[PDB]
Swiss-Prot record, chain D:
Protein name per its UniProtKB record: UPF0642 protein YBL028C
Family recorded in the similarity comment: Belongs to the UPF0642 family.
Region (Disordered): 1-20
Organism superkingdom: Eukaryota
Higher taxonomy: Eukaryota, Fungi, Dikarya, Ascomycota, Saccharomycotina
Further remark: Present with 6210 molecules/cell in log phase SD medium.
Residue ranges, compositional bias (Polar residues): 1-11
Shown residues within the full chain: 2 to 53 of 106
From Swiss-Prot, chain E:
Protein function: Component of the ribosome, a large ribonucleoprotein complex responsible for the synthesis of proteins in the cell. The small ribosomal subunit (SSU) binds messenger RNAs (mRNAs) and translates the encoded message by selecting cognate aminoacyl-transfer RNA (tRNA) molecules. The large subunit (LSU) contains the ribosomal catalytic site termed the peptidyl transferase center (PTC), which catalyzes the formation of peptide bonds, thereby polymerizing the amino acids delivered by tRNAs into a polypeptide chain.
Listed name of the protein: Large ribosomal subunit protein uL14A
PANTHER family named among the record's database cross-references: 50S/60S RIBOSOMAL PROTEIN L14/L23, LARGE RIBOSOMAL SUBUNIT PROTEIN UL14
Record flagged with keyword Cytoplasm: yes
GO cellular component terms given for this protein: cytosol; cytosolic large ribosomal subunit
GO molecular function, one term: large ribosomal subunit rRNA binding
Entry-linked InterPro entries: Ribosomal_uL14, Ribosomal_uL14_CS, Ribosomal_uL14_sf
Species of the source: Saccharomyces cerevisiae (strain ATCC 204508 / S288c) (Baker's yeast)
Disulfide bonds: none
Pfam families listed in its UniProt record: Ribosomal_L14
Family matches, as SUPFAM superfamilies: Ribosomal protein L14
Main location class: cytoplasm
PTM per Swiss-Prot/TrEMBL: Methylated by RKM1 at 2 different sites, but it is unclear which are the 2 methylated residues among Lys-37, Lys-103 and/or Lys-107.
UniProtKB/Swiss-Prot annotation, chain F:
Subunit structure as annotated in this protein's UniProt entry: Monomer. Associates with the 60S ribosomal subunit.
Misc. remarks from the entry: Present with 18600 molecules/cell in log phase SD medium.
Gene3D superfamilies according to UniProt: L-arginine/glycine Amidinotransferase, Chain A
The organism of origin for this protein: Saccharomyces cerevisiae (strain ATCC 204508 / S288c) (Baker's yeast)
Name recorded for this polypeptide: Eukaryotic translation initiation factor 6
Curated annotation (Swiss-Prot), chain G:
Annotated organism of origin: Saccharomyces cerevisiae (strain ATCC 204508 / S288c)
GO molecular function annotations of the record: ATPase activator activity; ATPase binding; structural constituent of ribosome
Top-rank taxon: Eukaryota
Biological process, per Gene Ontology: assembly of large subunit precursor of preribosome; positive regulation of ATP-dependent activity; ribosomal large subunit biogenesis
Cleaved signal peptide residues: none
Keywords: Cytoplasm, Nucleus, Phosphoprotein, Ribosome biogenesis
Cellular component, GO annotation: cytoplasm; nucleolus; preribosome, large subunit precursor
Compartments in which it is found: Cytoplasm; Nucleus
Function field: Involved in the biogenesis of the 60S ribosomal subunit. Ensures the docking of NOG1 to pre-60S ribosomal particles. Activates and recruits ATPase AFG2 to cytoplasmic pre-60S ribosomal particles.
Name recorded for this polypeptide: Ribosome biogenesis protein RLP24
Family: Belongs to the eukaryotic ribosomal protein eL24 family.
RNA sequence: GAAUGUUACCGCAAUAGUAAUUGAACUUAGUACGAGAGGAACAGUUCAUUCGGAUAAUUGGUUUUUGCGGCUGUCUGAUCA
RNA sequence: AGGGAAUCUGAACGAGAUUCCCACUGUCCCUAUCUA
């Protein structure tokens, strides 16, 4: 599948694997039969056990085979990256041994069930069942080395970083312990050691940052002097759609000659020739212009102690990577200050009200005391809403006293007339 | 079914007795622990719900409540129990010297044929400075780890055609046994009101003999119903008053009406006295005597702590269909009729 | 949910099934002629507004009425 | 799901019962016993109605 | 997934094997229920849906684009008498439901007829694609 | 001014709130953090109303309103209508509208000057929006999406439509509204842009799944900073 | 809380009584009992059936146009709650009820004349 | 249900059975932890599923109250019954 | 004056058989009540 693989079912060390599959067939299947039963129930008993152990080992083997990434079918970076970190031939030898063993176990189960429908005694049938599961055990005992390898690869691939070969990347290179660890330290949130020796870093550390509203990933590298740790860096340069930031130490530090950095830059030149290189400086000055003889290079002088030029290197890197009627506003809002969360002196929100009053789901918010009225003595509203079959809100208007008195006039205009006799 | 509710047999009496009581604190004031009435009624209430965290916070909920009729219980005795390795053991009961016609009726199965000569020699046993009564009351106060109150119901103030009141035993959860037996001494021949035992927003456990369905046919055939059931955690919504008109009036409705529906409840009369409006459905049917105990323990969740703001009481006709709250609203909507004019 | 004039219904059984509201509009001189009848009074006004509340007996109150309107045309 | 007799929930509910949850019941009890004490005086006035 | 806040009990009117109408302008006219997501389990009892419950339902009469794939369906019209907390019992004219993804996001751009109060409360994006509520 | 929040873990802000120039309307959820989300950004300047319509939390896509008025549907109880009037200042009018349709937040997309409506709305409301809100009313469709509210965010400053809107429809519709329109999204490619964010002349509140490349577009077209 | 009118009777529908019916057009048909609800289901004319109020209005057995009946309006523009403006309504509603009852009684007398 | 004087009321409790169940929703949180993608838990509160004990306020159902009404036929020489 | 359309069998058939489409129902979800 995609970038990373943490989600793999664990690999039992071939002795415990036996203790899982065989114990499960002892616990999950019926275990007690008399010799005095019918032969048909004796047959069906031991058949059920051979088959169930068959499905047992196969289930565990299938989990390994489907779980591990199909090395030559994933991605050219990952096909080669796993080839650098692990002996790719042995990685395919190990998984071939599991694929072999699963087909073996399938063959054993299919054999002994077919052989089992001809058993004449409980003893013969028992000897055949013991033969079957013992044979499966022998197959799994022959897997003590590849499964010990598969557990170690599972653990170490489970902790590998997830680089995206389709997002905007930028490799960070140079000699081991130039000061590029301080660069990624001061560009993003990733803890990389700046310990004063050669190979401090042993793998590709990743740092994410955001500029011009976009997802970037700068990949720290161990460095080039060939080793598995060293070749990891070179293949990261080769297979990633990236720009390479080769770092140089124009100082007494690093413990390596600057001329050796020149020799290494021009030697590794072919595989980063397509990548639009940036070079950052952290007779003699003339041999920096010898580095400048490369078609695509730029030279910049910076200091990691200050936080401005480290940002400016990033700016030029990202720039290289992209090319590769009136509204109504009340003055009560305009005059209002901003909400500073770490301020000792501000207004208390309802969030802090409910905490001070205790609990989230226990505090009942008073809908009253928050609405505007003429007299705040009648704030605690009762409001009848219903009187005798007819709801109050339908009768409720202003000037109902004057409207009532109009109907009072309409009383006396019918009072003296003589409708009530 | 449920194997706990076995044997699934007919109860000993309609008045089921309360099996357990709320514990005891020996610093609390003297107060009754269980009350009794007569369950008869069921009705609909709306209320706004101040239950925070819910989907119905500051919304309105309609719900079914039951009206138990509870006339003021009258104290006619006290029982003292010693703590034994065999359980409890009643050593002395004491009575009220002059008891009603109702309880002297409870002492006979055939009331009319008798000379009504129940407590004649017991009242004549009182007839002096006390001397023996105070001796038995000393006997209770000296020993007897728990003290229970003998009461009875006011059957005549209830519309029931039974005339025969029920005796009961109610323990006291007020500390110092001295104050128990002396509360009783202050309460012979006197009556106890409902709201002196309960109030609003209080959880109770109403116990009742469950509506007999007779013979019925491992899922076994036999008797269905008439079992003594205890149901716990029914919230009291309203305690009412007989003399007070506008019991059906809420903070919102405020129309002068009694919770009694038009033409009363079905198969049972009106209400002419104190009542408890309990939420949900209490076991038993109408006309059934229920005994209301209180909670056994501190049962506070937010279903027990919240305040009920009753908005409206449905007093429409349960016998038939409901269209009018008052008789006044029937002939207000109707206009005037034939026999009127 | 469909709305037409009564006059649109006149000029066309099949109409009444799909419809919900026929509308009364007094600005037309045509409706002023239809207003002055022994019909268009006694229950007929409310029958116009709520067409799916009617039933068979109130459909025939309209189907007889349409032919009265067609003879005026 | 935690049971009805789950030990941790019983202990969390005992943390509740020593706070607000009992105090409200211990105020309600005082209001009930108060009205019970009020019920003696009314009946004693109706004793003095006949004693008059 | 998708449902906002708690969900309370209303009566069950739409079992498995019930044909309801389709209400969105996606293309389908009707919907056949096959399974109800988040239901109880008795012996012999069919899974019964109600208003505002995500069911797995197939198109029977509609566009071929909406078919070939069994997809989630939220019931917006019930026609069986359920209860509201405001006193009344109510029911609609017909059974109707709207099709959506497992996240609760709508495929259609508008829902015809009334949408139930409970359904529009629980599902936010149904109320976003609602013309009529209640 | 672009705030990013949630209601009971929900990105659809416009469903659970209605925010205008003179008021903010919020649903009474268990969590008060949504109320405090606005009270942080708006303070005591414009009133934030703890409110419900028909006992539903889904207020913003049920109501209509601007600086002058407020429209609620038929299903609004007289207690909720009493409550809204009590909470609001007397400068803003309130009217319950009786219609075929009840989701007003999906039907009346408006600002302080203009309004877009559903093409099948009644004439009575068409002459009621004109009076209570005092705004120009248009029976206009946004790229065949008949509900104008959920698929168009709108202000006095500018507007935001769903990305399926045609260029011809952008020019034609912005000619009606007289504001610049940009086809954009909210909450990581959600098409519902009206309920995905609440907006006025000085604040834009989105959901916590709205990515920054979309957030820059929102800030630009509504011209905050 | 709202006490409604039955779509058939025009009788008072209390909360927790009868059934509300909603069409695909979406309007509310509240009923007070299943007598009225089944009468609606049968697709009857209410104004033909005598026991309803719709009949009694149009046939004029009861009154239709009156000054007391114009105050039971479905009212829309809300009031800011004055203690006085509610205390006035409480006595106003009890007043208008008395006058409406006396007027209806007078209408019954004016209808039942010529029988003696 | 006889018996242990009769008869009645209130009780005690040996013993026997016993029951609750699981799911997620809001704060706690977009915090801990995290290159990122993502992403918890206790305390507080809110619902629901299954199971049980109930109950009929309302809804729906139900009708030899055959309660009232309508239709068809049939008899009193016709109406009404 | 109960449908309809195919097919297997001896173009309609015949209470031939099967399958599907449409309608209907307590067969069921899930029982409830009444009468004899």
């Amino acid at each position: 599948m995609q970038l990373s693989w943490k989600d793999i079912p664990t690999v039992a060390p071939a002795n415990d694997l036996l203790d899982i599959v065989l114990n499960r067939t002892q616990r999950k299947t019926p275990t007690v039969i008399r010799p005095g039963f019918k032969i048909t129930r004796i047959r069906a008993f031991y058949m059920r056990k051979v088959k169930y152990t068959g499905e047992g080992f196969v289930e565990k083997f299938e989990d390994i085979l489907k779980g591990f990434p199909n090395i030559n079918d994933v991605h050219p970076f990952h096909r080669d990256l796993m080839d650098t970190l692990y002996e790719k031939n042995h990685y395919k030898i190990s998984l071939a041994a599991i694929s072999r063993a699963k087909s073996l176990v399938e063959q054993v189960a299919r054999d002994y069930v077919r052989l089992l429908k001809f058993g004449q005694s409980l003893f013969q049938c028992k000897q055949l069942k013991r033969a079957a599961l013992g044979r499966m055990a022998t197959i799994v005992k022959k897997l003590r080395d590849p499964l010990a390898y598969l557990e170690q690869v599972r653990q170490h691939i489970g902790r590998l970083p997830s680089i995206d070969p389709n997002t905007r990347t930028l490799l960070i290179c140079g000699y081991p312990n130039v000061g590029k660890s301080s660069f990624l330290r001061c560009i993003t949130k990733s803890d990389v050691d700046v310990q004063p020796y050669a190979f401090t870093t042993k793998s590709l550390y990743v740092g994410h940052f955001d500029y011009k509203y976009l997802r970037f990933q700068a990949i720290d590298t161990p460095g080039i002097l060939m080793n598995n740790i060293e070749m990891q860096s070179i293949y990261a340069i080769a297979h990633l759609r990236s720009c390479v930031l080769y770092f140089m130490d124009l100082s007494e530090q690093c413990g390596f000659t600057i001329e050796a950095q020149v020799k290494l830059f021009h030697s590794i030149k072919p595989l980063f020739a397509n990548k639009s290189v940036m070079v950052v400086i952290n007779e003699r000055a003339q041999l920096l212009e010898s580095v400048k003889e490369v078609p695509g290079v730029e030279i910049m002088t910076s200091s990691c102690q200050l936080e401005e030029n480290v940002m400016e290197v990033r700016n030029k890197a990202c720039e290289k990577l992209l090319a590769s009627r009136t509204p109504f506003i009340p003055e009560s809002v305009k005059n209002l200050k901003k909400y500073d969360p770490e301020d000792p002196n501000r207004r208390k929100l309802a969030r802090d009200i409910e905490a001070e009053n205790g609990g989230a789901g226990v505090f009942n918010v008073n809908l009253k005391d928050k609405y505007l009225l003429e007299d705040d003595e009648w704030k605690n509203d009762i409001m009848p809403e219903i009187l005798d079959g007819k709801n109050v809100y339908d009768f409720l208007d202003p000037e109902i006293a004057a409207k009532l008195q109009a109907l009072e006039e309409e009383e006396e205009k019918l009072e003296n007339e003589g409708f009530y006799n | 079914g449920h194997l706990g509710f076995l044997p699934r047999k007919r109860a000993a009496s309609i008045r089921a007795r309360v099996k357990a009581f709320p514990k005891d604190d020996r610093s609390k004031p003297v107060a009754l622990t269980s009350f009794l009435g007569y369950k008869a009624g069921m009705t609909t209430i709306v209320r706004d719900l101040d239950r925070p965290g819910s989907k119905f916070h500051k919304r309105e909920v309609v719900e079914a409540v039951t009206v138990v009729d509870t006339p003021p219980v009258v104290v006619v005795g006290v029982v003292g129990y010693v703590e034994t390795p065999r359980g409890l053991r009643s050593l002395t009961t004491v009575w009220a010297e002059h008891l009603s016609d109702e309880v002297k009726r409870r002492f006979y199965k055939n009331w009319y044929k008798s000379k009504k000569k129940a407590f004649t020699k017991y009242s004549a046993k009182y007839a002096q400075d006390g001397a023996g009564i105070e001796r038995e009351l000393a006997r209770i106060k000296k020993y007897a780890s728990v003290v229970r109150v003998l009461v009875h119901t006011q059957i005549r103030k209830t519309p029931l055609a039974q005339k025969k009141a029920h005796l009961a035993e109610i323990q006291l959860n007020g500390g110092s046994i001295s104050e128990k037996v002396d509360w009783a001494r202050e309460h012979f021949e006197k009556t106890v009101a409902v709201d002196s035992v309960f109030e609003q927003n209080e959880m109770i456990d109403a116990i009742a003999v469950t509506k007999g369905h007779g013979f019925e046919g491992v899922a076994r055939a036999g008797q269905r119903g008439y079992h003594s059931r205890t149901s716990i955690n029914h919230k009291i919504y309203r305690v009412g008053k007989g003399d007070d008109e506008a019991n059906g009036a809420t903070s919102f409705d405020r129309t002068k009406k009694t919770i009694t529906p038009m033409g009363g409840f079905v198969h049972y009369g009106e209400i002419k006295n104190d009542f408890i409006m309990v939420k949900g459905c209490i076991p038993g049917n109408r006309k059934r005597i229920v005994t209301l105990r209180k909670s056994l323990y501190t049962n506070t969740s937010r279903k027990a702590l919240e305040e009920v703001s009753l908005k409206w009481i449905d007093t429409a006709s349960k016998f038939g269909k409901g269209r009018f709250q008052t008789p006044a609203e029937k002939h207000a909507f109707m206009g005037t009729l034939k026999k009127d004019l | 949910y469909h709305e037409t004039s009564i006059l649109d219904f006149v000029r066309t059984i099949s109409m009444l099934g799909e419809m919900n509201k026929f509308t009364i509009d007094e600005n037309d001189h045509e409706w002023k002629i239809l207003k002055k009848l022994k019909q268009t009074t006694d229950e007929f006004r409310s029958c116009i507004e709520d067409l799916k509340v009617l039933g068979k007996k109130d459909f025939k109150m309209i189907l007889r009425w349409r032919k009265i309107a067609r003879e005026i045309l | 799901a935690k049971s009805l007799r789950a030990s941790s929930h019983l202990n969390a509910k005992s943390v509740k019962r020593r706070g607000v949850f009992q105090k409200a019941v211990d105020a309600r009890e005082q209001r009930i016993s108060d009205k019970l004490k009020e019920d003696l005086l009314k009946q004693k006035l109706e004793d003095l109605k006949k004693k008059e | 997934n998708g449902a906002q806040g708690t969900k309370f009990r209303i009566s069950l009117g739409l079992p498995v094997g019930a044909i309801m109408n389709c209400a969105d302008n996606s293309g389908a006219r009707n919907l056949y229920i096959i399974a109800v997501k988040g239901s109880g389990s008795r012996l012999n009892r069919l899974p019964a849906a109600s208003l505002g419950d995500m069911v797995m339902a197939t198109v029977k009469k509609g566009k071929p684009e909406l078919r070939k794939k069994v997809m989630p369906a939220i019931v917006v019209r019930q026609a069986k008498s359920w209860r509201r907390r405001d006193g009344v019992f109510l029911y609609f004219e017909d059974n109707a439901g709207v099709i959506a993804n497992p996240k609760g996001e709508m495929k259609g751009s508008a829902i015809t007829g009334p949408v139930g109060k409970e359904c529009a409360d629980l599902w936010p994006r149904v109320a976003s694609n609602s013309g009529v509520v209640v | 001014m672009a705030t990013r929040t949630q209601f009971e873990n929900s990105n659809e802000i416009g469903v659970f709130s209605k925010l205008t120039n003179t008021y903010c309307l919020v649903a009474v959820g268990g969590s008060e953090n949504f109320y405090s989300a606005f009270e942080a950004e708006l303070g005591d300047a414009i009133p934030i109303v703890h409110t419900t319509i028909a006992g539903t939390r889904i207020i913003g896509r049920m109501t209509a309103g601007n600086r002058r008025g407020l429209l609620v549907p038929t299903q609004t109880t007289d207690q909720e209508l009493q409550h809204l009037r009590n909470s609001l200042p007397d400068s803003v009018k309130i009217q319950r509208v009786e219609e075929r349709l009840s989701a007003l937040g999906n039907v009346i997309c408006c600002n302080d000057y203009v309004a877009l409506v559903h093409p099948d709305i009644d004439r009575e409301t068409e002459e009621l929006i004109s009076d209570v809100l005092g705004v120009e009313v248009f029976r206009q469709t946004i790229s065949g999406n008949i509900l104008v509210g959920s698929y168009c965010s709108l202000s006095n400053q500018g507007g935001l439509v769903h990305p399926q809107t045609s260029v011809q429809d952008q020019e034609e519709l912005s000619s009606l509204l007289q504001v610049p329109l940009v086809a954009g999204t909210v909450n990581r490619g959600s098409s519902v842009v009206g309920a995905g964010m609440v907006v006025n002349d000085y604040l834009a509140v989105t959901g916590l799944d709205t990515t920054a490349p979309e957030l820059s577009v929102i800030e630009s077209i509504f011209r905050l900073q | 809380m709202r006490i409604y009118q039955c779509h058939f009777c025009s009788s008072p529908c209390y909360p927790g009584h009868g059934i509300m019916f909603v069409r695909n057009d979406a309007k509310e048909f509240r009923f007070c009992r299943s007598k009225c609800h089944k009468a609606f289901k049968q697709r009857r004319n209410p104004r033909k059936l005598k026991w309803t109020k719709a009949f009694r209005k149009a046939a004029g057995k009861e009154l239709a146009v009156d000054s007391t009946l114009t105050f039971a309006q479905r009212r829309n523009v809300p009031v800011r709650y004055n203690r006085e403006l509610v205390a006035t309504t409480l006595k106003a509603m009890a007043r208008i009820e008395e006058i409406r009852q006396k007027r209806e009684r007078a209408f019954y007398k004016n209808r039942m004349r010529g029988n003696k």
